[PDB]
A paper describes a structure:
Here, we present the 3.0 Å resolution structure of [name] bd-II with bound aurachin D, a specific inhibitor of quinol oxidation by bd oxidases, as obtained by electron cryo-microscopy (cryo-EM). The homo-dimer contains two oxidase hetero-trimers related by twofold symmetry. Each hetero-trimer consists of the three subunits [name], AppC and [name] of which the small [name] form the major dimer contact between the two hetero-trimers. Within each hetero-trimer, the large subunits [name] and AppC are related by a pseudo-twofold symmetry axis similar as CydA to CydB from bd-I. [name] and AppC share the same fold with nine TM helices that are arranged in two four-helix bundles and a peripheral helix. The heme groups b558, b595, and d are positioned in between the TM helices of AppC and form a triangular arrangement. Heme b558 is coordinated by His186 and Met393 as axial ligands, heme b595 by Glu445 and heme d by His19. [name] features a long hydrophobic patch in a cleft towards the periplasmic space filled with an extended electron density that was perfectly fitted as ubiquinone-8. The Q-loop consists of six small helices (Qα1, P250-E257; Qα2, L292-T297; Qα3, L307-S332; Qα4, P338-R345; Qα5, L351-Y360, and Qα6, A369-A379) that are connected by short loops. An additional density was identified in the cavity of the Q-loop that was modeled as a bound aurachin D molecule. The inhibitor aurachin is bound in a hydrophobic pocket provided by the Q-loop and TM helices 6 and 7 of AppC. Interactions with Phe269, Val271, Leu291, and Leu295 (the latter two from Qα2) stabilize the Q-loop and it is apparently this interaction with aurachin D that allowed for full resolution of the entire Q-loop.
Numbering used by the authors:
A (entry chain F), D (entry chain C): 1 to 28
B (entry chain B), F (entry chain E): 2 to 378
C (entry chain A), E (entry chain D): 2 to 504
């Protein structure tokens, strides 16, 4: 079941990075 | 961990949880009970309600924690106590119904009848549970009429009305005095003004009532009620209540204090703490008063526990099958697992509850309420 | 009415009433966290107004949820003394741990979130909201872990010394296959409920010109969250069906109305009338080779029928009778080496012994009629379980369709261009509640002859209470719950009609 | 292992909703 | 040199050279997807320049990755004829399916992504980039599934008619426990490699005043992605260690340098010299009660030692000798009912029979010395595996520390305020490559006496090739790979020095 | 699915995959080989390279798919073919090395020597693989010198130089002609100008060469090479190459066409398609020319397959152990699983490759290259 876990995890990492960059872009 | 040591540690943990819940929900229910006796105006009622509005949920959750800890560590005590006191538990549940709704609904209708009804509901929900808990504790100290079949099934041989003897009523009055004193001290800690003076007067009266009630209960237990003696019991043996020898002797409740004179500190502490907190309030130092009130709650609860050190809810009708701390306990594995879980998580819970108190330490004055009148209930 | 039936009805009403407000809280707290996160990231103040307006309703629901939780907690001790005394050694760990961690977190930080707007900064407020959501979900996690252990006991062994089942392994108690799937499924259902609630209120706002700024953003959040949650909950429902097929064949047979074992292409009934006087269905509508594929994930794996299950439990009934006789001899102090050696064998059938005790006045001598009665009572009422399962599946499919349509309309950027989409979103509001109540009822009624699966029947788990003593409590709680529901629904309607513009 | 899967999945759903709203807010 | 050793060295060099460029592609494609997603959502054109500049280097690495992939594909047929003929019935499904789906997706859409900037819109370009990333990851998924089946055979049974192992169950072939953990672990390691590459180049830019707009955003993306990926890869490394302990005790013993079985508090060595002339370590540094907790997740579960494993394989060696004799009799057309009945038993030890065939010239009569030699050869060289494991763990810990520091500096918003942080980010660039190569070498060398675990030894899996025929190919590929590496590293250095401002 | 039907279906699938790969990488390698013969300038070389720059990866992946399909469906054929032709496979791998690097690196250095070197590398990588594949196919049609031990292990009894007989060289020349014709037709489809005229001339010459080479190969196979006859073989039996009866007879290759006259369409189609595509090119309709070229590739490949219908890589030294389509096959379960996976995914692959071609259909003129000179390589 690690395949679905990896899929959800990589999408989560992608979305977290996108959100952090959206929040942090004006502050740079 | 040795099984006997594990059981004693969990008994002490139950005592500590009860003390903490008593302190928290005691100042909470003191606010609830002093709402009509202090706040003579809608604004004053709003002030006293918003004094504990933010932290009341984290104080009520201690009651659920105590219930779960009883259900886990002492399933037999949990089942017998909540089955024999069926009407009592129904009453306390009906009382605790109102408190969340009373907090969250009375500020959403402009009509005065709605506010009056929910204030009455809050007062009932802050008054009934302490009295019923005191009555149940007094009945435990007197002997619950229940017994165990040869198969470990519990049946009850009494009614709710039989629990209304004068001694449990006195215990309930003592518990009500303790909670209203805690609430008055909390009002001293937060509110400023005429509410402060009224709460100081109420706290002094509550301390006098608590001291007198405690002395009367001590005398009555000394000269009026016989006690249970645990002749023999396997401390490390399986939790089988039937396999025990127990006889009823007069004045057996004082055996724990007489055998160990060092244990006399708890009754003395619980008796002299109300005087100390009255002195602190009159000295203008509410923090030391709150500390003394907390020590009073701890001392009274642990005095009650020490008086019933080898017996948890003894049975009056049948001397045998009276639950103890050695019996009426879960297996060693689950007891140890629960102990390690508590040791891991309880300090974190205390830490972040203290942080939440720190972030919300502002005094609840009239101007602060008026500024945020739209949101505060 | 009987005392046992009255207590069962009281627990039924209390659980349904409590769970009328739990999924809404579960969904709404995470949607509030979403709004707070958007406010922190983008910096726009509209989402702060959105989260305030929705948090008002969240607190309105949360108060009554907390109120019902206390009765749900104390009902085990008030009405199920024998059940608690029997299974506490293994059942107390989830109940205690939940209150120790998740209830504490949610209770403290909900007040901190409501009253910490002016004091705490944006980041601290966001962290507090996330803590509230995670605690609220962990409470459901532990409660559903306990319920899953009830559905499928694990790490449990009977002990003669304490006459109760004691915990054997905490690791397999926490990670039992049923509990994980049940937890994820129920939490996803709560997410669907919250998202549908938000979408329905936003659609009602958009049907008029009252609100268009808060309403559109709230509708978008609800649509995206609901689509993801409905996909997750359908997948977890399929997984739960597989787990029920693997663990509790009786419940699966009742759900699908299967009476007799049939070849591997087992036709999945969609409409049937499972009469119990005759062990057969009526005017069944069968789709061939459908239930066998879903239940067993393959072919050549026949699904047992109710008749076969009863036939298999008959020897289990005999062994349970023997075990009950041996246990009664043990409990009376009759310490015989032969009895001690014999009790270790056929020890796991004691639940069937209790079933026979209910169905046979004399345990020593039992006739064939009593065995037949016990076998008949070994299965639940098939028709309510079947219809509840069908209702839940249909409402789930309708939720999937509605949320897919809403997501398609949202991504296009034209939400208010079609009145029928908003009307569908509004009229789909009660569907998540109907589906979730039906699913919970099916879950707790498919195991009807067992308080604990194959361990303790519900009839013998009741406490020693009288008709009037239980009736007083039932009447009191029913009246109080009716009044509280009226007040709560009135307040919710009033503040949904008022709109976010009022505050 | 469904607990970790649920944790990652709910965080993923939260981040996806946040990203969709960030993208869609100007377009409204 | 021997032919078998020469082929093993050729495969070693080819695999290492191919995997010098795969993790970079895996990480960089997802980071490019992140940049494209940010560009689509926010709308700012800076991230478009970022993704163009990083996609240049991505393509530079991707070309050589593709170039090495062809040799990796054809080496099975060129140098392992017997291995392929033996295990193809079960090994062809992942290799064929990967090329059928993931290789097609990545190959088509990488060109579509490079050349579709002007034609495709923003959304289509984002979808194409996501498809490229998912295909690149699915290729790794299928390849690592094949390698995991190699590490732990599942759904495989020997067939007398075809003299080979044939597939028995595809479901357990895909979902074997080793393959899933190996796939997730390797993919997370590739993510760490890509994030560290981005962070190192961004830190090099920030050490000067050359770039501050692209560099800061790229550093933030790399830091967040690297922290998440390093947490994931450490967790999956622990899971992989548990799986290796459960499945391949010999590999675990070689990794931890455990020669003799020891009580449950087994001390975890951190520094040792596993000499093979004497089955013991030298100047070992032992931390008590550490390896037993990690390997077995509990206590009272002793970890077998190398000596015990050899002692247990000795009866397996005898059974394998019997099985090899029976199989040779079967293959020669000697169809005897006794032989046919006897071959069904002791059928799974044929690999030990092949080991004895290598270590015993005469199978019918074998002396104790030959058995001792086979037992000695049944375990890999302990010292390289031990040191590779230690190097990988240490580099992983250093990566965790560096990425945590980078994330802390990024969230504070002050990245360039400390020169030492940027210097640490730069000097940590080779560490992911060192760790990943060491981990792969340990993985493929811990199973050294087995091309397939307990099925086919590597020595007997070689094809029928001569020294010169293999040496010519080895020299040619080594020279071409050296030239290609020089050219690729020169281009990468040149375009990292050039900077995004040039384009 | 019946085992014999499954094996025949997978043989047909291998043929179809080979045809598609031949078409795609054939126009690709035709571009590669016509780069020096058509583009006399750096700009023209850049134009012809960027003509197939985007889609070349999706054409090369067909080769990997063919290799994986051989390794899965026919592990014995895969192992024997890639072990006997060891030097040949090393040469084709070394040739295919350059194509990705040649595409991606030559546009990043301003020096002319770098561009010339990478153009030479691309030409080598587009020229060698078709010739070597033709040589290997001719050797298969002539008989690979290998045998099987009683245990199913394959050993080789020949050298690389022994594969350089005139017939496989002719087959390699034919394959080179086919691929350069496909590349010329693709140039007709995309490029406009002097490149168009040069590619038209090259396509006409390649078609003439292909027709002449095909006729010569047909005559030589008719009168020069004896064939293998499969006397008996268990179609549904286990894939054991040893259990077969086979004898070598002259003119046996034409037995399939003589027994079934309907199979003569494939040789006729493959012979007359180059004339049709030349006519289409001279008619000014490159699309029909490309269709005719694809039909030529399909017809020639399937004619070669039909000539070797019951034999896949026969062994010249040992008549027995010659692999067939019935033998040298994986088990029924994995064969069926691979077939269903292909039926699921291959149509999707074709669909999105066609979509990718559709989105990138613009002609590659000089002005388009100049506009995007910075990015296009
Ligand atoms: C000589 O010393 C003494 C005196 O003179 C100084 C006295 O006056 C007295 C008489 C004083 C008393 C009876 C006062 C008792 C104390 C109080 C606060 C009044 C009772 C009211 C309360 C609200 C107590 C808190 C209790 C609850 C919230 C739950 C009550 C229990 C219920 C419903 C059933 C479940 C059973 C239990 C929790 C029993 C647990 C076991 C125990 C030993 C008690 C807890 C204490 C410990 C340490 C574990 C004593 C005993 C004495 O020893
Ligand atoms: C979704 C799973 C779920 C289920 C099946 C139940 N609950 Fe519940 N319960 C919640 C999830 C939850 C919660 C999410 O934690 C609630 C919802 C509203 C709230 O305030 O917390 C709630 C409230 C709540 C509370 C009040 C929390 C507090 O104020 O500190 C208690 C004590 C319980 N529940 C106990 C129970 C018991 C003993 C149940 C079964 C007999 C039960 N709940 C059913
Ligand atoms: C990370 C896991 C991984 C591993 C262990 C391997 N590969 Fe690889 N391979 C990739 C992951 C990958 C990839 C991510 O798909 C690559 C990286 C660069 C690229 O272009 O694709 C690559 C490229 C690549 C290609 C070229 C793809 C194409 O141009 O169509 C082939 C044919 C192979 N690999 C085959 C293999 C074989 C047969 C291996 C083992 C012997 C192998 N790879 C090791
Ligand atoms: C509402 C919403 C919903 C949805 C969507 C769903 C979806 C579904 N579902 Fe459900 N469920 C429910 C609600 C639901 N559900 C509930 C509430 C429950 C209970 C809890 C658990 O999970 O268990 C269930 C549960 C359940 C079960 C049981 C399990 C146990 O008991 O454990 C089953 C069989 C089912 C079926 C199903 C299906 C087939 C589907 C798909 C169509 N479910
Ligand atoms: C670089 C990065 C990295 C990291 C971080 C890691 C982290 C880790 N790790 Fe690792 N690994 C690696 C890289 C790595 N790794 C590789 C490459 C491999 C191969 C593949 C697989 O996964 O398998 C491994 C694998 C592995 C193994 C084996 C498995 C198999 O074979 O299957 C082991 C035992 C380990 C240990 C470990 C640990 C303990 C840790 C924590 C510290 N690993």
């Amino acid at each position: 079941m690690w395949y679905l876990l990896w899929f959800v995890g990589i999408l989560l990492m992608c979305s977290l990075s996108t959100l952090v960059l959206v929040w942090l872009d004006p502050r740079l | 961990f040795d099984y006997e040591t594990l059981r004693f540690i969990w008994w002490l943990l139950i005592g500590v949880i009860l003390v903490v819940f008593m302190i928290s929900d005691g100042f909470d229910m003191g606010i609830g009970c002093l709402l009509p006796l202090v706040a003579r105006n809608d604004d004053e009622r709003r002030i006293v309600i918003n004094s504990v509005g933010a932290h009341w949920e984290g104080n009520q959750v201690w009651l659920i924690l105590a219930g779960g800890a009883l259900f886990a560590a002492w399933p037999r005590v949990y089942a017998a106590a909540f089955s024999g006191f069926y009407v009592a538990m129904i009453l306390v549940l009906c009382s605790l119904f109102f408190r969340p709704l009373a907090f969250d609904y009375r500020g959403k209708i402009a009509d005065a009848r709605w506010r009056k009804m929910w204030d009455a509901g809050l007062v009932i929900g802050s008054l009934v549970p302490p009295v019923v808990f005191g009555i149940a504790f007094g009945n435990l100290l007197l002997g619950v009429p229940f017994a165990f079949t040869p198969q470990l099934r519990v049946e009850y041989l009494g009614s709710f009305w039989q629990l209304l003897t004068p001694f449990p009523l006195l215990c309930g009055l003592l518990s009500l005095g303790m909670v209203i004193l805690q609430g008055g001290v909390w009002l001293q800690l937060k509110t400023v003004g005429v509410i402060h003076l009224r709460s100081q007067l109420a706290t002094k009266r509550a301390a006098l009532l608590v001291m007198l009630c405690f002395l009367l209960a001590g005398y009555w237990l000394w000269v009026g009620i016989d006690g249970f003696v645990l002749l023999a019991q396997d401390a490390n043996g399986p939790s089988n209540p039937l396999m025990k020898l127990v006889a009823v002797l007069p004045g057996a409740w004082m055996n724990n204090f007489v055998e160990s004179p060092v244990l006399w500190i708890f009754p003395l502490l619980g008796f002299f703490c109300p005087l100390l907190t009255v002195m602190a309030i009159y000295r203008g130092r509410p923090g030391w008063g709150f500390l003394m009130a907390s020590l009073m709650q701890f001392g009274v609860i642990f005095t009650a526990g020490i008086t019933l050190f080898p017996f948890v809810m003894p049975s009056s009708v049948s001397p045998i099958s009276s639950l103890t701390l050695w019996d009426s306990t879960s297996s060693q594995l689950t007891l140890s697992i629960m102990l390690v879980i508590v040791l891991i998580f309880l300090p974190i819970v205390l830490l972040y509850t203290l942080w939440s108190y720190y972030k919300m330490w502002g005094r609840m004055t009239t101007e602060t309420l008026r500024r945020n009148e739209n949101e505060l209930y | 009415w009987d005392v046992i039936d009255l207590s069962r009805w009281q627990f039924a009403l209390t659980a349904l009433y409590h769970f009328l407000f739990v999924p809404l809280t579960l969904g709404l707290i995470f949607l509030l966290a979403i709004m707070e996160t958007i406010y922190v990231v983008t910096g726009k103040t509209i989402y702060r107004d959105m989260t305030r307006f929705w948090g008002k309703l969240f607190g309105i629901n949360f108060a009554l949820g907390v109120a019902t939780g206390l009765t749900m907690e104390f009902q085990f001790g008030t009405n199920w003394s024998f059940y608690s005394n029997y299974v506490g050694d293994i059942f107390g760990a989830p109940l205690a741990m939940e209150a120790l961690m998740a209830f504490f977190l949610e209770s403290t930080f909900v007040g901190l979130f409501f009253f910490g707007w002016q004091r705490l900064n944006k980041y601290q407020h966001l962290l507090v909201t996330w803590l509230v959501a995670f605690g609220s979900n962990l409470s459901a996690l532990w409660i559903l872990n306990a319920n899953g252990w009830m559905q499928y006991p694990t790490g449990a062994h009977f002990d003669i010394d304490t006459l109760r089942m004691e915990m054997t392994s905490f690791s397999e108690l926490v990670f039992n296959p049923v509990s994980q799937v049940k937890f994820v499924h129920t939490v996803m259902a709560g997410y669907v409920t919250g998202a549908m609630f938000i979408m329905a209120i936003s659609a009602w706002y958009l049907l008029r010109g009252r609100e268009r700024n808060v309403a559109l953003r709230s509708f978008a959040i609800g649509s995206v969250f609901g689509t993801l949650a409905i996909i997750g909950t359908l997948q977890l429902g399929d997984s739960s069906a597989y787990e029920v097929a693997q663990v509790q064949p009786v419940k699966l047979a009742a759900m699908e109305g299967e009476w007799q074992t049939e070849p591997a292409p087992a036709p999945f009934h969609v409409v049937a009338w499972p009469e119990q006087d005759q062990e057969r269905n009526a005017f069944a509508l069968k789709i061939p080779a459908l239930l066998g594929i879903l239940a067993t994930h393959s072919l050549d794996k026949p699904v047992p029928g109710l008749k076969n299950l009863m036939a298999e439990t008959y020897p289990r009934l005999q062994r349970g009778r023997m075990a009950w006789l041996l246990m009664q001899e043990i409990s009376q102090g009759n310490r015989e080496p032969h009895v001690l050696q014999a009790f270790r064998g056929l020890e796991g059938d004691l639940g069937y012994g209790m079933l026979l005790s209910r169905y046979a006045p004399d345990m020593n001598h039992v006739t064939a009629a009593q065995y037949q009665a016990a076998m008949r009572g070994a299965i639940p009422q098939v028709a309510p379980v079947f219809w509840s399962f069908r209702i839940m599946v249909g409402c789930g499919s309708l939720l999937l369709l509605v949320m897919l349509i809403a997501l398609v309309q949202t991504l296009r950027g034209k939400i208010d261009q079609h009145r029928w989409v908003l009307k569908m979103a509004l009229w789909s509001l009660p569907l998540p509640w109907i589906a979730i109540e039906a699913g919970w009822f099916m879950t707790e009624f498919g195991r009807q002859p067992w308080a604990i699966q194959d361990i303790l029947p519900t009839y013998s788990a009741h406490s020693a209470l009288t008709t009037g003593q239980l009736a007083f409590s039932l009447i009191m709680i029913v009246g109080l719950y009716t009044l509280f529901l009226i007040a709560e629904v009135y307040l919710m309607q009033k503040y949904a009609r008022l709109g976010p513009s009022a505050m």
